[PDB]
Amino acid sequence: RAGPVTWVMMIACVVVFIAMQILGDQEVMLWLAWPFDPTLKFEFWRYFTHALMHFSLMHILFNLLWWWYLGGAVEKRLGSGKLIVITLISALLSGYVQQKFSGPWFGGLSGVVYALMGYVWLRGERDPQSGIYLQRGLIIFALIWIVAGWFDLNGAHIAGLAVGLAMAFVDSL
Numbered sequence: 001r002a003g004p005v006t007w008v009m010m011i012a013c014v015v016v017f018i019a020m021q022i023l024g025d026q027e028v029m030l031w032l033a034w035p036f037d038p039t040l041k042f043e044f045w046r047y048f049t050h051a052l053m054h055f056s057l058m059h060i061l062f063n064l065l066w067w068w069y070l071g072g073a074v075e076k077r078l079g080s081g082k083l084i085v086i087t088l089i090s091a092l093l094s095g096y097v098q099q100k101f102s103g104p105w106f107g108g109l110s111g112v113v114y115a116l117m118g119y120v121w122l123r124g125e126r127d128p129q130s131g132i133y134l135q136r137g138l139i140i141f142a143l144i145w146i147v148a149g150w151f152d153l154n155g156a157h158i159a160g161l162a163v164g165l166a167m168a169f170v171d172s173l
């Protein structure tokens with residue numbers, strides 16, 4: 001079954017998704033979003049919590065489905081700590097880029113999901129010995145949920161994806 005870190009993310013995403021369904025999306029955003037006024041610049045959870053908000057049933061479900069498989073793989077084969085670093089960096093960076101081009105009003109775990117897709121894939125190609133890899137067919141359906149993100153079927157998913165690849169590079173050495 002699934003490790004403590006994969007578990008918690010899903011829960012928090014769920015609780016927050018529940019929180020969002022009850023209170024309203026603006027209301028939760030008001031507390032969890034990337035900082036949108038300078039009074040909020042010190043509230044350091046905000047650079048991260050944007051990842052926990054999903055806006056539709058299909059948003060959370062796919063992110064969590066992908067998180068479930070990819071996140072859970074890294075944690076089994078490679079450890080809870082590794083998953084934490086990947087999560088922290090990709091949320092910050094994609095969030096930063098997202099915020100920069102579009103604004104502080106966003107959410108979703110897909111920046112992180114992209115990093116995982118890029119990470120697991122490259123790490124399996126360049127370090128097959130480690131027992132990590134993205135299976136062929138999954139590469140296809142992953143390229144889709146990437147394409148889903150890139151044509152709006154916003155921009156900072158390259159950041160998420162980059163971080164994922166960048167880290168897989170380092171560990172292959």
Ligand SMILES: *P(=O)(OC(C)C)OC(C)C
Binds near residue numbers: 098108112145149
């Ligand atoms: P992602 O969770 O969603 C894309 C699949 C559209 O969104 C960014 C803001 C992380």
